[PDB]
Design an enzyme around this catalytic site. Structure first.
Site, short mmCIF file in Angstrom:
data_model
loop_
_atom_site.label_atom_id
_atom_site.label_comp_id
_atom_site.label_asym_id
_atom_site.label_seq_id
_atom_site.Cartn_x
_atom_site.Cartn_y
_atom_site.Cartn_z
N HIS A 77 11.84 -0.12 3.08
CA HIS A 77 13.10 -0.84 3.17
C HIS A 77 14.33 0.05 3.08
O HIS A 77 15.06 0.03 2.08
CB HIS A 77 13.17 -1.94 2.12
N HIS A 81 14.22 0.96 8.87
CA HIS A 81 13.63 -0.36 9.06
C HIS A 81 14.68 -1.31 9.62
O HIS A 81 14.40 -2.10 10.52
CB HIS A 81 13.09 -0.92 7.74
N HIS A 117 20.23 -7.26 7.21
CA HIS A 117 19.29 -8.10 6.49
C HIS A 117 18.59 -7.57 5.23
O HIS A 117 18.05 -8.36 4.45
CB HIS A 117 18.24 -8.66 7.46
N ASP A 118 18.59 -6.25 5.00
CA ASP A 118 17.95 -5.72 3.79
C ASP A 118 18.85 -4.79 2.99
O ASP A 118 18.36 -4.04 2.15
CB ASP A 118 16.66 -4.95 4.13
N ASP A 217 12.09 -8.68 12.35
CA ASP A 217 11.90 -8.11 11.01
C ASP A 217 10.49 -7.53 10.82
O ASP A 217 10.30 -6.55 10.09
CB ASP A 217 12.16 -9.21 9.97
N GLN A 270 -4.14 -6.01 6.32
CA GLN A 270 -3.28 -5.92 7.48
C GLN A 270 -3.77 -6.98 8.47
O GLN A 270 -2.98 -7.63 9.15
CB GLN A 270 -3.34 -4.52 8.09
C1 VIA Z 1 8.10 -7.30 2.66
C2 VIA Z 1 7.31 -6.67 3.77
C3 VIA Z 1 6.75 -7.73 4.77
C4 VIA Z 1 6.01 -6.90 5.76
N1 VIA Z 1 6.56 -6.34 6.92
N2 VIA Z 1 5.59 -5.64 7.58
C5 VIA Z 1 5.84 -4.93 8.84
C6 VIA Z 1 4.44 -5.75 6.85
C7 VIA Z 1 3.11 -5.24 7.02
O1 VIA Z 1 2.77 -4.55 7.96
N3 VIA Z 1 2.15 -5.56 6.06
C8 VIA Z 1 2.40 -6.34 4.93
C9 VIA Z 1 1.32 -6.58 4.04
C10 VIA Z 1 1.10 -7.97 3.68
C11 VIA Z 1 0.01 -8.35 2.78
S1 VIA Z 1 -0.26 -9.88 2.39
O2 VIA Z 1 0.28 -10.29 1.26
O3 VIA Z 1 0.25 -10.66 3.32
N4 VIA Z 1 -1.85 -9.90 2.38
C12 VIA Z 1 -2.52 -10.53 3.66
C13 VIA Z 1 -2.65 -12.06 3.72
N5 VIA Z 1 -2.97 -12.75 2.42
C14 VIA Z 1 -4.33 -13.35 2.53
C15 VIA Z 1 -2.88 -11.95 1.11
C16 VIA Z 1 -2.67 -10.39 1.20
C17 VIA Z 1 -0.87 -7.25 2.26
C18 VIA Z 1 -0.67 -5.85 2.62
C19 VIA Z 1 0.43 -5.48 3.53
O4 VIA Z 1 0.70 -4.13 3.96
C20 VIA Z 1 -0.06 -2.97 3.57
C21 VIA Z 1 0.59 -1.80 4.30
N6 VIA Z 1 3.69 -6.86 4.72
C22 VIA Z 1 4.68 -6.55 5.69
MG MG Z 2 14.01 -8.40 3.27
ZN ZN Z 3 13.30 -6.48 6.52
#
Ligand code: VIA
Ligand code: MG
Ligand code: ZN
Length: 313
Positions: A77, A81, A117-118, A217, A270
């Protein structure tokens, strides 16, 4: 300042040269200066500069004040980004043909929102109602810069326009709160499904701009594999950092999402993130404009890559 002088005096290459029109665009090899120039080209080719009489030097200063309000010590962030989110908005507007569906004011507000936004993100993230505490701060940070002397890029708008633009900029930034995304997409997805989505509906227009912001985003999840993997590791780093810090200060044990160990679980998560949050969104966007297919397409190819890693793990 010297930096401002350099920026305001440099030649702005064409969007084509900058390659900011394609969804596959990557910032990694660009210098800060180059990103600021890309940003100028963005405001320029969207006709925001002339349509709203933005003074070049003021635009330049505003771009630097915004970049400046992002913390580089924060893994994901940061300025880059914010810049990529705006690059995607530009790309979606041009190559995605979303521009003809919005007014100049909606466009002006979206570009600014994407870039802001961030603002001043400290690296403290959420999980999935928190009342958008963080995004409110980002907006407060955005308004502050928009009002600071010498950075007033919105001066030039009538009072009613300023009021309109501000309202939209706020909704745009708050919309980047995933909780609100989840809270609203259901209705958006229903319309697209029932085949009755109507941008001519004020409510359906706002809903769209919100979905659009969240789509830009998360644009990293759509980029080519090498880029996606690289940014993904930045996301991981920030989360792990937060898990460690959160355990340092408070005796709290990080959820697997934020715990440094169990990092061999990023492919699995992911894929989870893509399935639960991204795919439906990018697919739905394709129904608005088919020229946004690259986003959907890129998201799928990434899910295959991450899936391979998860099984292979
Ligand atoms: C605040 C950041 C939101 C975000 N942006 N981008 C581009 C990503 C991303 O690529 N990955 C994740 C991400 C999300 C989860 S999650 O919370 O959504 N996760 C998957 C779905 N559920 C079942 C629980 C765990 C777990 C790991 C992550 O990234 C590792 C690099 N968040 C973002
Ligand atoms: Mg944000
Ligand atoms: Zn953002």
């Amino acid at each position: 300042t010297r930096e401002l002088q350099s920026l305001a005096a440099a030649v702005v290459p064409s969007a084509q040269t900058l390659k900011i029109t394609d969804f596959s665009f990557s910032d990694f090899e660009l210098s800060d200066l180059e990103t600021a120039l890309c940003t100028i080209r963005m405001f320029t080719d969207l006709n925001l500069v002339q349509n709203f009489q933005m003074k070049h030097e003021v635009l330049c200063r505003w771009i630097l004040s915004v970049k400046k309000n992002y913390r580089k010590n924060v893994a994901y962030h940061n300025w880059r980004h914010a810049f990529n989110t705006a690059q995607c908005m530009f790309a979606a507007l041009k190559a995605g043909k979303i521009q003809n569906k919005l007014t100049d004011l909606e466009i002006l507000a979206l570009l600014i929102a994407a870039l802001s936004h961030d603002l001043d993100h400290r690296g403290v993230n959420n999980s999935y109602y928190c009342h958008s505490i963080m995004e409110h701060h980002h907006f407060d940070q955005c308004l502050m810069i928009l009002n600071s002397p010498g950075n007033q890029i919105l001066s030039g708008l009538s009072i009613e326009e300023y009021k309109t633009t501000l309202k939209i900029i706020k909704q745009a930034i708050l919309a980047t709160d995933l909780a609100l995304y989840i809270k609203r997409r259901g209705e958006f997805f229903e319309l697209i499904r029932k085949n009755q989505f109507n941008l001519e509906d004020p409510h359906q227009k706002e809903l769209f701009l919100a979905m659009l912001m969240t789509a830009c985003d998360l644009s990293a999840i759509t980029k080519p594999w090498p880029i996606q993997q690289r940014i993904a590791e930045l996301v991981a780093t920030e989360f792990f950092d937060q898990g460690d810090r959160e355990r340092k200060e408070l005796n709290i044990e990080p959820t697997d999402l934020m715990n440094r160990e169990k990092k061999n679980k990023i492919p699995s998560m992911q894929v989870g993130f893509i399935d639960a949050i991204c795919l439906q969104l990018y697919e739905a966007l394709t129904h608005v404009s088919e020229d946004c297919f690259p986003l959907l397409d890129g998201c799928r190819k990434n899910r295959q890559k991450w899936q391979a890693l998860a099984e292979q793990q």
